[PDB]
């Protein structure tokens, strides 16, 4: 029993983290095989923060202007190129610690673990979700760019996120490992704002199922709802619309608990109307939306890697 915001074990990603310095600018890189991936704004000076032409900034650099350190070892860069908003630094040694890995682009609502690093060294690991507005509510300081987010599939690491920047509300934006930003953000320091965010409904429902699996039913009620009436209500609370695919995704939790998805939808409509009246659910006084249906099953069953 119990339920926690649980991250993936970080060991395999720890072994890929390096430091990348160009000039006086430093951040983290990801070393897989004989390539180090890092955000391209490492080539920026303090004067290149507003409107950098990265193609122009890059052509002025040679291999030896990139200082890559893996622990106490300097890696020799033998090649460099730009792919969207990441740099690929070819180095003369393959990372002996490279895990089985893939590069994936996730959808809003999906979760991942972040290994927060500075100077190529791990500071901590936490669990995140790609928000509907394509920001992540991370914990990142100056120097954290190049930290990555990931999922594990037994022994295969799926890298889904590279950290680039912080927006003025204190949320974060980054790219996939092909250097394509999530959302309409760009790697310059001109004015940018996250759009209005919404709640990840399918995840709130999965979390409510986790509550039932852990023995709590106080929030259910005797009603049902149509999908359309559910969405008409939930959207007045800035909840994302629930699609039929979402309903299908919740099938396994529905089947394990004996609660039909639209009946848990009715419970959610009431919880939004009432609040919790001094109660908590899995230790929270808010409806938690950064657990997917798969996160729930994984934590409540004991899936390992």
């Amino acid at each position: 029993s119990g339920f926690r915001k649980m991250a993936f074990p970080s060991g395999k990603v720890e072994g890929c983290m390096v430091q990348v310095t160009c000039g006086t600018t430093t951040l983290n890189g990801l070393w897989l095989d004989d390539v180090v991936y890092c955000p391209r704004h490492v080539i920026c000076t303090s004067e290149d923060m507003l409107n950098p032409n990265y193609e122009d900034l890059l052509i002025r650099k040679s291999n030896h202007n990139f200082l890559v350190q893996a622990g106490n070892v300097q890696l020799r860069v033998i090649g460099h190129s730009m792919q969207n908003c990441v740099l690929k630094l070819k180095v003369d040694t393959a990372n002996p610690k490279t895990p089985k890995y893939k590069f994936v682009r996730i959808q809003p609502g999906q979760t991942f673990s972040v290994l927060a690093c500075y100077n190529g060294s791990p500071s901590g690991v936490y669990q995140c979700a790609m928000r509907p507005n394509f920001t992540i509510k991370g914990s990142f300081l100056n120097g954290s760019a190049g930290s990555v987010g990931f999922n594990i599939d037994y022994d295969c690491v799926s890298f889904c996120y590279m950290h680039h920047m912080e927006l003025p509300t204190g949320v974060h934006a980054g790219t996939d490992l092909e250097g394509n930003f999530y959302g309409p953000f760009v790697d310059r320091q001109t004015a940018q704002a996250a759009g209005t965010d919404t709640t990840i409904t399918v995840n709130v429902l999965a979390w409510l199922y986790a509550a039932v699996i852990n023995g709590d039913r106080w929030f259910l009620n005797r009603f049902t709802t149509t999908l359309n009436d559910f969405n008409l209500v939930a959207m007045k609370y800035n909840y994302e619309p629930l699609t039929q695919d979402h309903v299908d995704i919740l099938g396994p939790l529905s089947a394990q608990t004996g609660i039909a998805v639209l009946d848990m939808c009715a419970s959610l409509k009431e919880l939004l109307q009432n609040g919790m009246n001094g109660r908590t659910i899995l230790g929270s006084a808010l409806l938690e939306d950064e657990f997917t249906p798969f996160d729930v099953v994984r934590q409540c069953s004991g899936v390992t890697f």
């Binding site: 704004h41 920026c44 500075y118 100056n142 912080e166 927006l167 953000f185 320091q189 001109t190």
Partner: peptide
């Protein structure tokens, strides 16, 4: 405020 590219100096 403005966005911040989170390298370090």
């Amino acid at each position: 405020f403005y966005p911040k590219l989170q390298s370090s100096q």
